[PDB]
């Protein structure tokens, strides 16, 4: 029996200078499952954090290709979701 | 035109010997004739390819 939880779509947050700059504007970036869509991510975030989500922005990034002694290797490709919270705006401290 | 729809008679393969004994490949097709038969006494007619041997045997029913 499959039990679908909203917490498997969201994999991990994104930590970087750009992500922090978005955070000071109440905008958070997550690494989501590559087979998810904007509405699914919005619903999952609303269920997880009990927050009102205004908009979700997605972008696909190709993993970097690295040279090794064995040859060429490619890292995993990932999808990023940039979630903007509503005016209620209680910060996500789990970040 | 070479495979009977009743008994499956197929063409034969052989050689065409000339006066100088030059053997060249050739085929012996069956004498296939298109006959509209009557499968049941109801009267339905269907076009089938039956060899003349099948017609002689009465296996086809051209009623």
């Amino acid at each position: 029996a499959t039990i679908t939880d909203p917490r498997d779509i969201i994999l991990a947050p994104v930590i970087s200078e750009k992500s922090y700059g978005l955070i000071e504007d109440n905008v958070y970036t997550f690494v989501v499952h590559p087979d998810s869509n904007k509405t699914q991510i919005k619903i999952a975030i609303e269920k997880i954090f009990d927050v009102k989500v205004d908009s979700v922005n997605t972008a696909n990034r190709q993993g970097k290709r690295k040279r090794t002694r064995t040859g060429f290797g490619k890292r995993k490709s990932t999808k990023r979701a940039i979630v903007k919270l509503a005016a209620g705006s209680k910060p996500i401290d789990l970040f | 035109a070479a495979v009977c729809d009743i008994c499956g008679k197929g063409p034969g393969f052989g050689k065409s010997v000339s006066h100088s004994h030059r053997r060249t490949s050739r085929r012996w097709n069956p004498n296939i004739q298109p006959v509209r038969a009557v499968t049941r006494p109801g009267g339905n007619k269907q076009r089938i390819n039956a060899c003349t041997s099948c017609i002689k045997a009465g296996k086809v029913s051209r009623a």
């Binding site: 029996a1 039990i3 917490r7 991990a12 970040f95 | -």
Partner: protein
């Protein structure tokens, strides 16, 4: 974690809830690893194995 012994003693409902809290704990551990403040790396392995165990028990119960 929890060995299958007493895991099989639970009924379907609390098995579902145990799966759910284990998934939430895995979510928290993944976020902590992403930020990088927790030291015990084996916690992720243990939680994943508990989730697999409860899934297997549920499958056995529903199959027979």
């Amino acid at each position: 974690g929890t060995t299958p012994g007493e895991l099989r003693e639970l009924t379907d409902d609390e098995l579902k809830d145990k799966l759910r809290e284990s998934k939430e704990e895995l979510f928290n551990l993944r976020f902590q690893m992403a930020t990088g403040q927790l030291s015990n790396n084996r916690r992720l392995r243990t939680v994943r194995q508990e989730i697999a165990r409860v899934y297997t028990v549920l499958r056995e119960r529903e199959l027979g």
